[PDB]
Design an enzyme around this catalytic site. Sequence first.
Site, PDB file in Angstrom:
ATOM      1  N   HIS A 121       1.519   1.664   4.055  1.00 27.22           N
ATOM      2  CA  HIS A 121       0.733   2.501   4.962  1.00 27.22           C
ATOM      3  C   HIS A 121      -0.688   1.982   5.166  1.00 27.22           C
ATOM      4  O   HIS A 121      -1.486   2.653   5.829  1.00 27.22           O
ATOM      5  CB  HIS A 121       0.702   3.951   4.469  1.00 27.22           C
ATOM      6  CG  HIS A 121      -0.047   4.149   3.187  1.00 27.22           C
ATOM      7  ND1 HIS A 121      -1.420   4.052   3.103  1.00 27.22           N
ATOM      8  CD2 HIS A 121       0.384   4.460   1.941  1.00 27.22           C
ATOM      9  CE1 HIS A 121      -1.801   4.282   1.860  1.00 27.22           C
ATOM     10  NE2 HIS A 121      -0.726   4.533   1.135  1.00 27.22           N
ATOM     11  N   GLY A 123      -8.769   5.993  -2.055  1.00 28.69           N
ATOM     12  CA  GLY A 123      -8.862   4.566  -2.266  1.00 28.69           C
ATOM     13  C   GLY A 123      -8.122   4.050  -3.479  1.00 28.69           C
ATOM     14  O   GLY A 123      -8.201   2.850  -3.766  1.00 28.69           O
ATOM     15  N   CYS A 145      -4.848   4.014  -3.812  1.00 26.41           N
ATOM     16  CA  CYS A 145      -3.547   3.465  -3.460  1.00 26.41           C
ATOM     17  C   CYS A 145      -3.477   1.989  -3.828  1.00 26.41           C
ATOM     18  O   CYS A 145      -4.467   1.259  -3.752  1.00 26.41           O
ATOM     19  CB  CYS A 145      -3.270   3.649  -1.968  1.00 26.41           C
ATOM     20  SG  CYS A 145      -2.696   5.296  -1.523  1.00 26.41           S
TER      21      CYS A 145
END
Lengths: 306, 305
Positions: free
Chosen positions: A41, A143, A145
């Site tokens: 993503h 942030g 991820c």
Amino acid sequence: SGFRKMAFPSGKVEGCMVQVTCGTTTLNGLWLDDVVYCPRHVICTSEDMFNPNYEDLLIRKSNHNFLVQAGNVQLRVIGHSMQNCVLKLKVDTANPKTPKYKFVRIQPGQTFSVLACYNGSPSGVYQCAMRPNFTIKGSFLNGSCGSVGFNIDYDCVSFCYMHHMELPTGVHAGTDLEGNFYGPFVDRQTAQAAGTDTTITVNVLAWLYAAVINGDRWFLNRFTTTLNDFNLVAMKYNYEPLTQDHVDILGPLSAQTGIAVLDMCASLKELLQNGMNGRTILGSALLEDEFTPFDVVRQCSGVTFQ
Amino acid sequence: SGFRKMAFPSGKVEGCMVQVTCGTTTLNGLWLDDVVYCPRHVICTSEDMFNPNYEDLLIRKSNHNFLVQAGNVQLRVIGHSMQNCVLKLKVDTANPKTPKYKFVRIQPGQTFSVLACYNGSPSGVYQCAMRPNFTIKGSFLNGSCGSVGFNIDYDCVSFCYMHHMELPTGVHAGTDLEGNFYGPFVDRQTAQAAGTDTTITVNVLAWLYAAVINGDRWFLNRFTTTLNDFNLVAMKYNYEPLTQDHVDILGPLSAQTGIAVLDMCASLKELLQNGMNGRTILGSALLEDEFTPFDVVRQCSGVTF
């Protein structure tokens, strides 16, 4: 002596954390050999996430649309690919700090260590457990991820988790390193929720075994129980049904301690029925379920007089 | 979201852990530049751990019996001294993995990450707190001597602890990296009684600020108390006295949540007298005193290194 929720040393994973920037979004990436793994993503916008067609959006993107940063060194993307929910970015140079690794998919109830990262730099390391509803009770922020979960055995780092999102209840969901989510979750801005979570009963008993090894033993009683009479009492307090493999895996601890598995279950029933009377087991007013029996053996050591 | 007892990244410390073998005794060393730090009783056998004359036993010690090994490589010790309770071996090769570091001594109530090592190989990392009785509730087995504790600020690893011994109750005693023991302890496996352990009050208050941030605010009351009337209930519940310096440290946490420092003290006074009534704060039915105010800001801001 002593007993702490312990994580693996994060050295071999810090040597693989990079920063992946696609457009305006920046998350973390895993630099193994000449490939950078990150959640797919990263290519979407805030509007795309409501209904992403990852095949179309990835077709539009180019190699120079991916900024991979290994601290201050720019990493040159020479090719992009996709595998389920994980984006694989080929780079020109292989990571010289690549450790012996392998991708694995753990089962609910097991444990692993998470290296929380932001902009490619580590913030901390803690010990998690894959809950039965395939979520984790982690500590992630905007942030985070791309942060990976792992276990280190001997010298091999077994990567087993990659963070992707947070659920409305505050828990977290992610994938294995091959892009397959843990649970019924999708990387789409849609209505989602974690299922009903049950307590990991096999872990609670291993935690009670560690307490007897460490001196705590007020919870021990003289009564006993049967497996069926325990499997049903626990359902009122929302515990996992104790399987036979759960009784068997508590074997090495049972021999090290000398208290049979069915005997430890009886003390657990009294603590769920009549509470702990305000006392503490290893300094916890609640019953801990995030220690696998292997983690108890790894920390408490202990011998078996055969 | 979420809030865990989180440890610092141990990367810059792992590259400093070596093995030190003198006689049959083997423990861990801290390789910084060309100096290997380790507890001085690597010269001692397990039998000579009752009351050893360390200076005398060191006068009869030699450099060629001082084995230092980093992985497979063997380090050649060119000299040795002794600072308080810490051996300082001088090796030929400077540590290439040496991070920016500094030696500090910490106060009771502060936290740090422990890197448990055995035979020079790191095995686990966990967050611990220097208890008011100058002990730590750590996890150490036979061979963990030399394991160090540390904090990280910017790129500087701030070493602050070195494991030495386990006490009768199971707690552990150690020194700073300058050799001075924390608390009234000595490097002698004798009857050393850790004093009365009190509760860190400023760390519980900071742990309450993390609860308000993470959606747990049922304990928030409208009552208010003075700093004097607050320590009244604290002393009868074995809590440290909350000084004015503690209030100013909780300042930034007080501003983010819009809750007064003493208003939270009123929320804590009710939790001390009336318990928590079967409720859990951040998933814990006990008050956690191993989270410093900086540790709450560090986790809730995603501060990296």
